[PDB]
């Protein structure tokens, strides 16, 4: 029985720049448990029908989890632009899979956790699909070398969401789980109960 519960119901979630990836393999996947009672639950699939998942079989499945702003839940989709799509988490234009998200204001908006969720704001190039940049090197904005310290035209690349419960929904923290269904010319190891 695949460990979706651990993934979706983790106590903490990763920052978007250091998004987590969990291989799901050699297991039976009850996709009917993919739900919760958080306020703005979304479940969006691309090139695949979620009503067929439990009659489908895959080589492997990956669950990518992270937290972003509500504003940005739209950037987690094929062919999107913006800070998150460009510098933090990128799906390919050809993406097949599902993006599951929900409002997590009740957990991720405490002051004590103000630095727990970060995002990359400056970067030399855009990330290719499914790349992860967890580097913390000063970003040279211009001509002069930075010599390891932040200053004029030299920025620390990561900024903090600093979530607060009093903010508008669009600024509140949302937990996101991205499911990629790998399909190789190899034996299936992840099947729904019906298959």
């Amino acid at each position, epitope marked *: 029985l695949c460990p979706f519960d651990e993934v979706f119901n983790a*106590t903490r979630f990763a920052s978007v720049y250091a998004w987590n990836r969990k291989r799901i393999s050699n297991c039976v996947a009850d996709y009917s448990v993919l739900y919760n009672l958080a306020p703005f639950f979304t479940f969006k699939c691309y090139g695949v029908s979620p009503t067929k998942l439990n009659d489908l079989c895959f080589t492997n499945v990956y669950a990518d989890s992270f937290v972003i702003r509500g504003d940005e839940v739209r950037q987690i989709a094929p062919g999107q632009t913006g800070n998150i799509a460009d510098y933090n988490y990128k799906l390919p234009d050809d993406f097949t899979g599902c993006v599951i998200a929900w409002n997590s204001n009740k957990l991720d908006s405490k002051v004590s956790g103000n630095y727990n969720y970060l995002y990359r704001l400056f970067r030399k190039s855009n990330l290719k699909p499914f790349e992860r940049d967890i580097s913390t090197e000063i970003y040279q904005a211009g001509n002069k070398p930075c010599n*390891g310290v932040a200053g004029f035209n030299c920025y620390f690349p990561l900024r903090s969401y600093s979530f607060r419960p009093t903010y508008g929904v669009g600024h509140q923290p949302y937990r996101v789980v991205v499911l990629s269904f790998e399909l190789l010319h190899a034996p299936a190891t992840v099947c729904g109960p019906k298959k």
Partner: antibody
Amino acid sequence: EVQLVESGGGLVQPGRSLRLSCAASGFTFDDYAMHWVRQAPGKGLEWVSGITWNSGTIGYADSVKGRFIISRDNAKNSLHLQMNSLRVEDTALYYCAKDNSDYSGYYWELENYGMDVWGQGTTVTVSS
Amino acid sequence: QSVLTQPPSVSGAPGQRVTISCTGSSSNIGAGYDVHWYQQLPGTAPKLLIYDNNNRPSGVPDRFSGSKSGTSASLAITGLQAEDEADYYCQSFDSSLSGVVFGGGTRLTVLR
């Protein structure tokens, strides 16, 4: 056998930066929370930060919040700590440490962190 | 100052029973988080000694024991041996700070 080897320490002047790293060996890295714990010469253990099995930052000692950044890399079995705007009182031996429990943890449960294996510390000195 | 409070010093003679107290708050120990104990020698990395308030890591002799009640926890050493001379640290979690919290540490001297 579990092995945790810190690196990245050294001497640094106030305001500068430093990135520590910890190579994890002998266990399933991504089943466990990882922790940074520091110890100033002749003082007590102070938890710096820690990160869950799914790369979820737990928190920061209020003395380093905003200046330090924890991160893990589950493909290279590695733990990291970016230290920015270093202050003199950041001088300490910095331990990597594996959490005792492989329990996944869920949001309606009380977290339980304890470190059953410790590395030896990479020394960090902040001095003008 | 640490959020968990620990006597700087305790001492006893060989064979006696010594205890070390660790008091917390509504935020951490009274909030229900487990308490763990560590043992360190000068020049040595720490070593887990008690976990989940009363469980002994394999190889920690049964003459160490631990207890937790309300806002407080305690480590008990009953057959004190010269070997037991070390620093001991209690540890828990504080939901107010969302972080692990160590006690200030206790110097335990086995009086020669």
